[PDB]
Each structure stands twice: as structure tokens, then as C-alpha cells.
Symmetry: D2
Subunit: 248 residues, 4 copies
């Protein structure tokens, strides 16, 4: 029994990590998935890795024209959207003294601005009864060295779920934020050394009660819950999938 039989889903940043794992499980559950991202190469590989009911679209969420084009493709092909997973994101570690206007803009364009407009332009296609999902982060409720702009961006993403819960209740659409903890993705690697990238995993595992970094498939599933009708009476929440990290 497929928990998303025939639902159409749109996943932003679906060619890697969380989005990709969520794309797999979604397809596995019988959905049609549009994976969105910038890298052509990784979009195709993802589309291959999934093998079914996926189309891969190239689009930069910081660009209004790329998003307009995305949603045009969505209507040609699947017509409406049951589930939206605003999951594009990135981090640059910089402390307060190091913050430049460009760093601020780079961080907030993809993480917040981009997000905002991907949900805005999906609106005409969203079916009433639809579920939207925003990826924030445990960073949104913590004070971490050099996460200044990223944490603040993610805190802003969670706030958008509250607001959109109010603005869209009139169409029976649920907007929810998922806040991953430490999930094993390329995002840990890309913040230089791969010796000191394992320092970062060992640290976040030490910190988390469950004593391990999360798997992307475990975030996929939590997102699947909020996507499914099992979460039919769940709106506006912040779901922590962090092994207990923020829960003490």
C-alpha cells in the first residue's frame, strides 16, 4: 500500500542528500516527483538512481524566471501539486566579525528568499488538502559558532510555516517545518579537510542522545509523515528529527 499513490510532489534541492532520499521514499510510496536543483549532472544521476515517475528540472531558486519555468513544466506534465518540499539550502560558516554583505545575501537568498518564492509560485498549482514542508534546522533554536546567518535564516523558515498555516487554512493546506539535526549528507563535507569533517560528525554524535548522526532516509521518512495523510491534523509545527539533540 502506497502512502502517496498518485500524489504529485515537488522537491526543491532533490538531486542530493535529504531531497534525494525523500524523492526515493516518495516514489517508493507511489508519487510523481519533480526533483529541482542547479547541477545538471547530479539531477540526471538522481533521476537515474530513482528510476521511476521522476522528472528532473534545472532551476535556481534564487531566480524568479527559473521558478516560473519550473511550475510551467509541472503543469504541462502533472497539472497540480499535492506535496511541496521546500528543501533547498546551504551554509557558510562565518562568525559575526567575518560577516560580509555578500555572505549575508548568499545565505538569505537561497535559504529564505528562494524558499519564500518557491511556495508563492506553487500556490496556483497546489491542490486544496495539499501539504507543504519547509526544511529548517536545529540551528534555528541554537547558538552555534559561525552559524550566524544560516541559523537566522532557518529560524525565519520556521516562522514562515506558522504564517502560511494561517494564510492557507482557508484552502485546507498544511504547512510544516522539519528541523533536521545531524544528517549524513554532502552538507557536512562541503563546509576543507576530510579529517576535520569527521571531527564535525564525532562532535554532533557525542551531542545527540541517540549517539549517531541521522541517515537521510530517516529524514525522508519524517518528511513522508508530514507529506502523508497520517499527519492530516498536523499544521504549523516544527518537527525535530535530531536524535534528541534539542530536546535535552
Amino acid at each position: 500500500m502506497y502512502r502517496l499513490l498518485n500524489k504529485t510532489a515537488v522537491i526543491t534541492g532533490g538531486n542530493s542528500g535529504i531531497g534525494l532520499a525523500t524523492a526515493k521514499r516518495f516514489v517508493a510510496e507511489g508519487a510523481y516527483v519533480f526533483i529541482v536543483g542547479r547541477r545538471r549532472k547530479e539531477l540526471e544521476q538522481a533521476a537515474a538512481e530513482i528510476g521511476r515517475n521522476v522528472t528532473a528540472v534545472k532551476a535556481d531558486v534564487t531566480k524568479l524566471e527559473d521558478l516560473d519555468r519550473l511550475y510551467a513544466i509541472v503543469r504541462e506534465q502533472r497539472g497540480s501539486i499535492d506535496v511541496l518540499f521546500a528543501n533547498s539550502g546551504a551554509i557558510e560558516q562565518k562568525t559575526l566579525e567575518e560577516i560580509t554583505p555578500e555572505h549575508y545575501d548568499r545565505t538569505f537568498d537561497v535559504n529564505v528568499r528562494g524558499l519564500i518564492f518557491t511556495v508563492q509560485k506553487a500556490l496556483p498549482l497546489l491542490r486544496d488538502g495539499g501539504s507543504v514542508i519547509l526544511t529548517s534546522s536545529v540551528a534555528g533554536v541554537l547558538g552555534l559558532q559561525a552559524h550566524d546567518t544560516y541559523s537566522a535564516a532557518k529560524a525565519a523558515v520556521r516562522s514562515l510555516a506558522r504564517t502560511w498555516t494561517t494564510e492557507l487554512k482557508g484552502r485546507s493546506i498544511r504547512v510544516n517545518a522539519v528541523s533536521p539535526g545531524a544528517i549524513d549528507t554532502p552538507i557536512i563535507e562541503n563546509q576543507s579537510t576530510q579529517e576535520e569533517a569527521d571531527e564535525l560528525r564525532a562532535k554532533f554524535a557525542a551531542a545527540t542522545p541517540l549517539g549517531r548522526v541521522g541517515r537521510p532516509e530517516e529524514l525522508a521518512a519524517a518528511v513522508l509523515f508530514l507529506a502523508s495523510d497520517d499527519s492530516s491534523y498536523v499544521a504549523g509545527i516544527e518537527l525535530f528529527v535530531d536524535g534528541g539533540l534539542t530536546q535535552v
Copy 2:
């Protein structure tokens, strides 16, 4: 597809409302379910309503001997516990001026004390990898007229999830709180006398909730099913609000 295939679950207060709906969906998902409660009549009717892989046990959670007996029955029959749903509860509306020592005790015995000991005595039977679930309430994060003791009890239940997340991580057991909002159960009916003024209470909580309706027990069951399942395998210590947005503004 059976998301709890062959998992043994124990549901406290499983002869009514939330526990019962959660018992159904659990069985539907291929589990074995022990529904616990005080009323003999409603236990049997529930056991009938479910129709399979259920056994109904009579036990008052405020009584240590009833719990000891419960877990003895569990050990005979299914041997171990994969999922525990501490979901027994009740409310008496009383304001601060009205609070009596008995009212305080009644409220806290079932809601907190009982809860505490049902999880304590399940411990030897819990499989590592197991999932425990505590039913608190949006009341835990709100200031509602005459919910003084109930809200405080529920706030305490949520705290136990944090603590037990730390104490039991060494056995890979997840403890999570679910906080329902306004779910259509006999708990709304049994506070007030009139059934005209019990609909006033539903209309009020529906007005308050973004989604504009009282929750269905089957919708709580499902959220509890999530926390019960492996889909929530990296989710510990949380407070899951299933309240249609009520506390999320």
C-alpha cells in the same frame, strides 16, 4: 502494508477514544495489542470492535498491583514489548480557588504518577529499539480556565519524555510525547453536564484551531503510529502537536 508487523504493543487507556483508535490502526498495521483500562464492559466491546490480535486487560494505573499483574500477563502471552503508549488520562475542570487536595491527587495519580509507573514496570519487557509514547496535551503549553492541575500534569508528562530520552538512550529506546489538541472523544462529553454545552466546547476549539475542526481519533492514532513506527527512527524526546495548528498560531 503492515508497518508494525509482529510488533507487540501495550496501550494504556485502550478501551476508548485515542487509545482505541490507536489500537485499531496498530492491529491494522499487524501488531499485537494489549488494551488496558478500568471498565470491564468497555474493554470487551473494544476487544470486539478490533476483532483480532488484541487482548484486553483490566487494570487501574494508579495501582501498582494492577500494573504488576498487567506485565505478568504480557510476559506469559507475547513475552516482550516493542511499543508502549502511556495514554491513560482524565481531567476535572477546577479553578485555583476550587482546588482541593483530593482533586489534586486524583488528577496527578492517573496522569503523572500512574504514567510514571506504567513506564517503570514495562522496562524489563521493552525490547531495545523500542518506542515509548506519552500523551500530554496542548494544555501543557497553555493557560486555560480551570485546567490548573490537568495542564500542569500534562506539562509534567512532556518533561518525562525529555528525561527518559536521556535515561534510556543506552538501550536505543525512543520516548516521545504526543500533544493532541481537540480530538472528538468521550473526554469532551464527560466534563460538562449538558450535551448542548458540550457542543459549545467543540465549537470553541474548532473556532480556535486554524484547520477549523476538531481532530478525529484516527488522526491521533496515525500520528502515534508514526512515533511507533521506524519512520520515526531518528526522533527522540519530542513533543508532537496534533492540534490542527492551535498552538502553532
Copy 3:
């Protein structure tokens, strides 16, 4: 200046630690203070240490009769109550497997039950415009080894502030919870004195500000919630924990 000039305050557990420091600063600010507690010895020493506008009353908050007697004394002497500081409390460290019904009762009687009734019986004496204050704990939003009942009790105390904010708004009374982090009091000692410094070193390591709080620093935060500076502050949870819970 004297930010509590002529206000009458009642402090529960005022013969030690947080209550005592809060009693000093309160008096310093020109209030009349009733310090409440069980130990006769420590009540008198506190009453001496303060030196002015204090009366010390013996009362166990788990006893209804001791509370009835307390508020009778308050009436005789100062007549009404401007500020109430429900600050009695205690902890026994026990894990889930160790929890006994007695341990559960002991913890919840003082921390919650007692608290509940001290605010109930103060009600007739509270002036409209009054401020009530409840002492919970960072424990209320954390999962600490062996703090099962204490943390849960404190989480319940914070909930009572939300409720009482609603129930008493009609009399313009503010109810607020203060949640201390690690404040240097006898509560750390009474849970070896070598392994009591292990507990301080651990909570200082954990807290951004890198140190255990002083009781005088809690007193002041409680003084804020007591004063008119916190006129438009109701139902809150004020963390005075050096950042501990914030991350």
C-alpha cells in the same frame, strides 16, 4: 530609590539560598518581607542577617494548617500582599528504575502541591496589581539523569504560571515563572563535597557565561518580575541560567 517601597512581600523558602538573597534585595528595596521555611534555627539567622522589616514564620508548605496559620499572621501584621514568591523546593536524584511512590510523593508535595496551595491561600490577601512569582528550573525544559520527578514537578510549576495568568488577569495580577540554572546554593551540596564540586564544574562548563550563578543574581531577576518595571510581563518563563538553555 527603593523599587518596592512599602510593598509587602511573602517569600516561601526564605531562610536559605535564593529566597534569602531575594529577601535581602527586597528589604534593600524597601519592602516588608515574610520569610517562610521549616527550620527554626535558619529562619532566625536569616531574620538576623536581614536586620529589618522582616518577620520569620515557621511553616511546612505541604501542610494546609501551616499555610492557614501563615496567612493569618500576614493579616495581623501587614494586612495585604503585593508580591508572592513561591520558591520552596527540593530535589532527590533518582532514575526511572529507582523511583518509589514515596520519592514521587515527597518531590511533588513540596514542589507542586505545596506551591499550588500557597498561591491558593494567598489569594484573599493579594492586592490587585500584585505580582506572583514561581520558581521552576531549567530542569523543566531538559532531560537530566535522575531528575525525573524534580524536572517534571518544575515543568508543572511553569504550567501553573500560564494558567494563573488567565485565571487572575481580571484582578490585574501577574504570575511569572523564573527558571534558574545553576545558582550557588545549599541545594547543590545536599544532593561528598569533592563530588559536589564536580557538579559545579560540569554546569559551569555547560553554561556560556562559564560560571555558576550567584543567589543575588537570581534575587535581582525575581526583583524585576516583582517590580513595576515588569508591569506588562505576565505568564512568562524567565531563564536566569547564563545562557545554558538557550544554546
Copy 4:
């Protein structure tokens, strides 16, 4: 008498509402105050209304050059900063469908970007032991019609307090967020008719347990707490001054 005797304070958006009331009470408590804002007229009137130990500086917080100039003036005159009150802010009500890139930028430039950089450039002047204060809003923890960007910005401001608590603990500096509820200021007037501005007040008074809109002087005081040594063991918090509104 005088809880800020000889402390130098810098207040951003100090020619009106919250900042101005906070400027008065600060001066009343024996501080030196720099009130910052864009309007020349209102800066002078504020400087007059206060009457003592104030200097008024014209500066747009969205402009790096205006901030550099501000802190140069501060160096000339008082040399160091004991208390910083990042309190500049503004709101435009727009729902999700109405959000334009410009509206997004306008909102986030003052409320977040500006804020970020006013704290960055104060850093060299801040005395160890200093207290920073950020003005967010109950909006940060709520889902209000048409508050999309403002609420999200304010949610981000609160996040910066957590982070800066970690980053600056090494200099014994406390960073705290204050989240006002409904305070009687020109910010209510300037969104909307003055008939339909007094509703907005009736609505927020209805909502708040204490049954009234807050006074600016009552926010000033709460900010004075966080400014003073009475809050010497208080870092990283979110202080709600909302009459109970968000505390249910």
C-alpha cells in the same frame, strides 16, 4: 538612584516609540545615550524631549557608511559602549501572494541585515561586561495574516541573540532579545484610516490577558532590566513583554 550611572548607551531607532521611551528611562538612570534614526526632524525633537546627556545622530542602518560614521562619532565623544539596543524596525503588511522581491528586501534590510551590521560595527567599542539587546516581536513566534516577512525577520533577530551569546561569551557580553507584544507607538498608525488603526488596538487588547496595549515606558523598563546589572546572569533569552499574549 541611577542604575546606568555613567554607562554609555547606543539606541538604534531612538527618535520614536520604544527607542525614545528607552532613551528617556536610560538618561533618567544616568546614562549617556546616542539616539539613531533617519528623520532629522524627529531626532532633534527627541533630543529636546530628553534634554540631557543625549546626542542625536542621523544614520540609515541599511547603509554601511552611515553606521561607520555613527561609531566614529561615538568614539570621538564617549569612547566606548556599555549598552547596545538594536531596535530599528518596520513592518509592511503583505500576504504570501502579494510578496514582491522589493518588499522582501525592504523588510529584511532594516530588520535583519541592518541589525546584524549595527552589532558587528559596535564590537570594537563594546566594553567587556557590556549588554546588547535585540528587538524582535511576538510576531516571531506566531502566524499572523500578512506578517510573512516581518515575522520571519523578527524570528531571525531572536536567533542572532542565541548565536551572539555563544560568540561573545569570551568577552563577558550578554546578548538578549526583547519581544514586545502590542505597544502603543506610531508603528500601529503607519500600517493602515485612523478609525481602522484603533481597531487593530482593540483586537490586540482583546487578545492579551492584561486586556490592554502596552506602554512604551513599560518596554523601556524591560529593556532597562536587560541593560542593567540586575540581569547580570541572563544571556541569550527571549523576554516577552506582551501582557501574556504568547504565554496563553
